[PDB]
Design a protein around this nucleic acid. Structure first.
Ligand SMILES: [Mg+2]
Ligand SMILES: [Mg+2]
Ligand SMILES: [Mg+2]
Ligand SMILES: [Mg+2]
Ligand SMILES: [Mg+2]
Ligand SMILES: [Mg+2]
Ligand SMILES: [Mg+2]
Ligand SMILES: [Mg+2]
Ligand SMILES: [Mg+2]
Ligand SMILES: [Mg+2]
Ligand SMILES: [Mg+2]
Ligand SMILES: [Mg+2]
Ligand SMILES: [Mg+2]
Ligand SMILES: [Mg+2]
Ligand SMILES: [Zn+2]
Lengths: 97, 217, 96, 25, 87, 129, 81, 206, 121
RNA sequence: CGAAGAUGAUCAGAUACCGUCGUAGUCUUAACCAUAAACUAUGCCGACUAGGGAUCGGGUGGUGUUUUUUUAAUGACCCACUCGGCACCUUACGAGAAAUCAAAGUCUUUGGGUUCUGGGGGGAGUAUGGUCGCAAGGCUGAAACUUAAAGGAAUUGACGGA
């Protein structure tokens, strides 16, 4: 039977979206389905902020950032514990948490 | 006597209500079967069906017995009760209790000419439970109850003499068939015929009238 | 509006549609194609006489374990060969 | 069989059936 | 209903809903009957005397019973300026 | 598109009589609708109704009291002999004592009891009970 | 609301409707006596006027057509009907 | 019906307008639109307090028609009305239920908290939704205190009031208790005020 | 792990529900009077019941205990709950009424002190 | 990048998954094919029935913000409507076998108009005939024979390299 009403994706008025490729296993998956996360990371790490500050010309420089939009297939997001299979009533919830 | 809870019960065992049509008219919930046992003493019970329902377990099947009981007198009242229990005698006894609590009136009528003592129903009525649909059609005199034997016993215990029955869906589902027929004979006062168009002065409830013969203090 | 046409002049469409859909039943198909007179070794008949060719022992379907004691028979009116069960205890001793 | 490969095996059988008839025709 | 020889045979005319005129039947346990006290001179409540309405479980479940009771009470004079016909 | 306006009228009447409203607005108000509503009104199933005269086809507002169970259209308008009125009354009416099968007849739009008294017959329009 | 008066609704509830969804349908547009500041002669101009309407004195535009009501040319004086 | 002394007084107007019972919600449902009077800017609608007072007097007429008063149950699960239901309980007959309702109190006769009322007054139809839903089983009419966004299902007498304010809830319960006492011999005159103050129906911190 | 079962707890609640003007904050006399006012079948069970009763009494000393409802608690509630503010609130400090609020006042036609102050929106 | 194919691993085997290459293909011109879980597994047209909020396009009204600087265009934004759209949320008046559904409602109280499809599971989308296509194939399409279930939804349990 029909598990979901927005079947597994987000397509109301297209027919066809476009495919993206998953960033972990290269699977083709439509962009509205895919699973989309943002990776906003600091350029180094948490520990070496003091090391990179103590090794710095230009004191208090910027600590630049990496911004990567990651696209997952359903299998790879489940296996990497990004989405984590929910109960039947609690899979209707659509909030970020 | 039980010297009960339930204000309506404290009216009924005190004798302030001596007629089940007062409860029917004021739509009072009957939560004690002794009210029905006093206001309708000549009520006959009949066991339609005892069947086993089963639950799968870690090791074994737990079986319980579902009893379907029709209670009623042939003067316009039946109830229907479905009870599941570990033993069939307990299922039948508590089914008698629940069927007594579910007693409703039926509007009997004429197929049509109003020469006395109504034999039939007043209206085509329908009832649905599950996939089963039961339709009762008024029938002329001496037609009998033209129905399958479970529905025939329910209408005989309701005091219909003269009815046609159509059915649809799986009528071998006996509890759904009897529940659809019970809904159908509950709809008989549900229908508003033109002889009930006259607007009546809305009588005061016995719980408001004998309010101190209720409310034990 | 329930799929079928309702109008007063739509009896042609209603009857042609019923004639087309009537073919999906087993009995109407079998009666109208004349299956009993082309197939069906008892060629429309209720009974048929035949000559015993052989006594067979058919092993019954599972979960039943028995030998069923049938005969192979060539039909006299038709020439078709059929297999016929010999019903009762014994009675294959009675055939020949 | 998956019904796709049942259909595919049917196509392989159909080509052989219409080649063995074009043999005689 | 009545037979030919007089003899009203009903067993029992059901109450009808004061907002909708549907029959209020026995299994309908969401229906209510609201008694309003009749008020004499100098604002007592007259124990025994009511303006009675009956509302069915249909309108009470639909949420229309409050506006229905507003209209019924304003028609019988209990309320003065709560209900407007032109909504 | 629209093909019967009596169907829309009676459907709107039924859908508000189910929900317990006391007034329907009916568009677009033919005189067949008016003469159906007049039979319903003289048998008591509906109250006052009022024809709003816009200059196109009219609207109606109908007062619904509480009394109507179902009003329907029998589409198509079948030809009804005078002997097979009783089949339509047995099939559409819930009891033999009340309910009306509305026929359109050259004698007029009328219920089946009136048509039986006048010994006329015609095409069937609908029913009311 | 389960009881309402469909024959006489409020003027607010009929101004709050579409021009076709009123009890009797009719236009919400109007006409304008428009006087350009050159002469005193007055041109009647539609509300939704679809056309660069010219006067005789101010013979360029009185109104500018838009997707709804026309835009009058910023110096013209308008009176309704 | 009501002769002359049941109309709104300037003293009661000062009470309601001071305690802000006229300040409704920002979203109005269709069944509480008639109690709206000319929505104030910055969102908040204004409740018709004359209509509030008229429904309150009608509700008190319903309360002073049940013969025994101890089966006129007052409900408040919200902490603002919990003082006020006990005060209404003390002043009228009025069996109170403050705090938890315990489902199975109108059905389920073998509970200790089993009551058979004839009328149930609730403070919020959102928070006291269980008591309303269970009064829907045993034929009990509901007087509710309602805002413009409170639900109206199985609510028979909506008294419109600002449910978001403790002064509004306590004052509405106060006027209800006062008028039920005016419609008996406890509060023998319609005009001289009640020496039991409005302010002991108001929930207190800390 | 010293969590006490419902046979101890229910017995202690049913002892404080009716013998409050009795048993006090001392285990030794509580242990002694459990022998009279109850039939506890063993000394260890009596000691657990008496100690939990004493633990509950030391809690009724400082505030009340939910689920404990005896008839010396009700007057202790009612005397505290009879309080009314002496400032006599819902009076007039000097009645701030907004614009549509004053239109409501005028449409009623009642005498109200006013201060029409517009709503910043 | 990669049906096929080489090639390296794995494995009992591995003619697979993994790795390295790699022809057809992927792109395009000129033609063919005409099928997809071509799905919203939900024909099209019409009317009615219950509440809300968001959003997209158009329009209407604020003597509303953004140019607060003397009686401060427009665009952009805000508020309130309105029509049209993609949808969503709540409820169940209703419907359903249920899952669910504002349509899958207004159905035994069965008729608004109309087209197409289905009649237990297989055999079988097979055989044959015709027709289209260069072909692959498409469209139309049985029967003999066989079978007592196949299936749908939900429940409890048990199991899972969840
Ligand atoms: Mg699945
Ligand atoms: Mg697609
Ligand atoms: Mg026709
Ligand atoms: Mg090679
Ligand atoms: Mg296809
Ligand atoms: Mg799909
Ligand atoms: Mg398809
Ligand atoms: Mg189409
Ligand atoms: Mg604008
Ligand atoms: Mg139905
Ligand atoms: Mg069949
Ligand atoms: Mg088949
Ligand atoms: Mg072929
Ligand atoms: Mg399944
Ligand atoms: Zn000019």
């Amino acid at each position: 039977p029909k598990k979901r009403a927005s079947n597994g994706r987000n397509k109301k008025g297209r027919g066809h979206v476009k495919p993206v490729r998953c960033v972990n296993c290269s699977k083709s998956i439509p962009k509205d389905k895919a699973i989309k996360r943002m990776a906003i990371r600091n350029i180094v790490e948490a520990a070496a902020v003091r090391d990179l500050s103590e090794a710095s010309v230009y004191p208090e420089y910027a600590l630049p950032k990496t911004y990567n939009k990651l696209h997952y297939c359903v299998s790879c997001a489940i296996h990497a514990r990004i989405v984590r299979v929910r109960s039947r009533e609690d899979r209707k919830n659509r909030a970020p948490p | 006597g039980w010297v009960p809870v339930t204000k309506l019960g404290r009216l009924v065992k005190a004798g302030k209500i001596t007629t089940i049509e007062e409860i029917f008219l004021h739509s009072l919930p009957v939560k004690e079967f002794q009210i029905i046992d006093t206001l309708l003493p000549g009520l006959q019970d009949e066991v339609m069906n005892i069947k086993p329902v089963q639950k799968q377990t870690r090791a074994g099947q737990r079986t319980r017995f579902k009893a379907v009981v029709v209670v009623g007198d042939s003067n316009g009242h039946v109830g229907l009760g479905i009870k599941t229990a570990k033993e069939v005698a307990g299922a039948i006894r508590a089914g008698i209790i629940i069927a007594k609590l579910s007693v409703i009136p039926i509007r009997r009528g004429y197929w049509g000419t109003n020469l006395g003592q109504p034999h039939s129903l007043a209206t085509k009525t329908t009832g649905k439970c599950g996939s089963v649909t039961v339709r009762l059609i008024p029938a002329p005199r001496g037609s009998g109850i033209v129905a399958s034997p479970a529905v025939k016993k329910l209408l005989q215990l309701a005091g219909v003499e003269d009815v046609y029955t159509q059915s649809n869906g799986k009528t071998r589902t006996l509890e759904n068939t009897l529940k659809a027929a019970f809904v159908a004979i509950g709809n008989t006062y549900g229908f508003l015929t033109p002889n009930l168009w006259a607007e009546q002065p809305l009588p005061v409830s016995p719980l408001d009238i004998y309010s101190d013969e209720a409310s034990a203090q | 509006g329930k799929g079928k046409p309702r109008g007063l002049n739509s009896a042609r469409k209603l009857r042609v549609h019923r004639r087309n859909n009537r073919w999906a039943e087993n009995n109407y198909k079998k009666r109208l194609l004349g299956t009993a007179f082309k197939s069906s070794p008892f060629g429309g008949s209720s009974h048929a006489k035949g000559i015993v060719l052989e006594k067979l022992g058919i092993e019954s379907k599972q979960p039943n374990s028995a030998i069923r004691k049938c005969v192979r028979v060539q039909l006299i009116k038709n020439g078709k060969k059929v297999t016929a069960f010999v019903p009762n205890d014994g009675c294959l001793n009675f055939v020949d | 069989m998956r019904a796709k490969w049942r259909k595919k095996r049917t196509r392989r059988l159909k080509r052989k059936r219409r080649k063995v008839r074009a043999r005689s025709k | 209903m009545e037979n030919d020889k007089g003899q009203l045979v009903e067993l029992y005319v059901p109450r009808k809903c004061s907002a909708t005129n549907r029959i209020i039947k026995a299994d309908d346990h969401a229906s209510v009957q609201i008694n309003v006290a009749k008020v004499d001179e100098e604002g007592r409540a007259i124990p025994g005397e009511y303006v009675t309405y009956a509302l069915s479980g249909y309108v009470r479940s639909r949420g229309e019973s409050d506006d229905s009771l507003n209209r019924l009470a304003q028609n019988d004079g209990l309320l003065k300026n709560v209900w407007s016909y032109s909504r | 598109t629209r093909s019967s306006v009596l169907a829309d009228a009676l459907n709107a009447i039924n859908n508000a009589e189910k929900t317990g409203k006391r007034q329907v607005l009916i568009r677009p108000s033919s005189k067949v609708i008016i003469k159906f509503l007049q039979v319903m009104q003289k048998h008591g199933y509906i109250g006052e109704f009022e024809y709003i005269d816009d200059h196109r086809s009219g609207k109606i507002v109908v007062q619904l009291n509480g009394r109507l169970n179902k009003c329907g259209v029998i589409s198509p308008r079948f030809n009804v002999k005078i002997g097979d009125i009783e089949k339509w009354t047995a099939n559409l009416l819930p009891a033999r004592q009340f309910g009306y099968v509305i026929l359109t007849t050259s004698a007029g739009i009328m219920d089946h009891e009136e048509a039986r008294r006048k010994h006329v017959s015609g095409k069937i329009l609908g029913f009311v009970y | 609301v389960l009881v309402q008066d469909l024959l006489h609704p409020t003027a607010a509830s009929e101004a709050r409707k579409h021009k076709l969804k009123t009890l009797v349908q009719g236009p919400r547009s109007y006409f304008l006596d428009v006087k350009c500041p050159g002469c005193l002669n007055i041109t009647t101009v539609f509300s939704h006027a679809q056309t660069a309407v010219t006067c005789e004195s101010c013979s360029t535009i009185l109104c500018t057509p838009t997707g709804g009501k026309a835009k009058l040319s910023e110096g013209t004086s308008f009176r309704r009907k | 019906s009501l002769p002359a002394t049941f109309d709104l007084t300037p003293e009661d107007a000062q009470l309601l307008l001071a305690a802000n019972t006229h300040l409704g919600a920002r979203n109005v449902q269709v069944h509480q639109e008639p109690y709206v009077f000319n929505a104030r800017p910055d969102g908040v609608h204004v409740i018709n307090v004359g209509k509030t007072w008229e429904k309150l007097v009608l509700a008190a007429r319903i309360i002073a028609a049940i013969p025994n008063p101890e089966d006129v149950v007052a409900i408040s699960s919200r902490t603002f009305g919990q003082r006020a239901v006990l005060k209404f309980a003390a002043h009228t007959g009025a069996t109170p239920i403050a705090g938890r309702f315990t489902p199975g109190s109108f059905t389920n006769y073998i509970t200790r908290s089993f009551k058979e009322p004839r009328l149930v007054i609730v403070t919020d139809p959102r928070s006291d939704a269980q008591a309303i839903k269970e009064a829907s089983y045993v034929n009990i009419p509901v007087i509710a205190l309602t805002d413009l966004d409170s639900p109206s299902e199985f609510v028979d007498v909506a008294i419109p009031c600002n449910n978001r304010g403790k002064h509004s809830i306590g004052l509405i319960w106060y006027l209800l208790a006062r008028e039920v006492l005016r419609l008996r011999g406890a509060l023998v005159d319609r005009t001289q005020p009640w020496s039991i103050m409005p302010d002991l129906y108001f929930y207190r911190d800390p | 792990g010293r969590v006490r079962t419902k046979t101890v707890k229910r017995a202690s609640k049913a002892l404080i529900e009716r013998y409050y003007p009795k048993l006090t904050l001392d285990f030794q006399t509580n242990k002694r009077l459990c022998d009279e006012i109850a039939t506890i079948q063993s000394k260890r069970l009596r000691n657990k019941i008496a100690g939990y009763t004493t633990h509950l009494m030391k809690r009724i000393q400082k505030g009340p205990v939910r689920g404990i409802s005896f008839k010396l608690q009700e007057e202790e509630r009612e005397r505290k709950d009879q309080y009314v503010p002496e400032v006599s609130a819902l009076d007039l400090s000097r009645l701030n009424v907004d614009n549509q609020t004053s239109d409501l006042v005028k449409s009623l036609g009642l005498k109200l002190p006013l201060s029409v102050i517009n709503v910043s929106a």
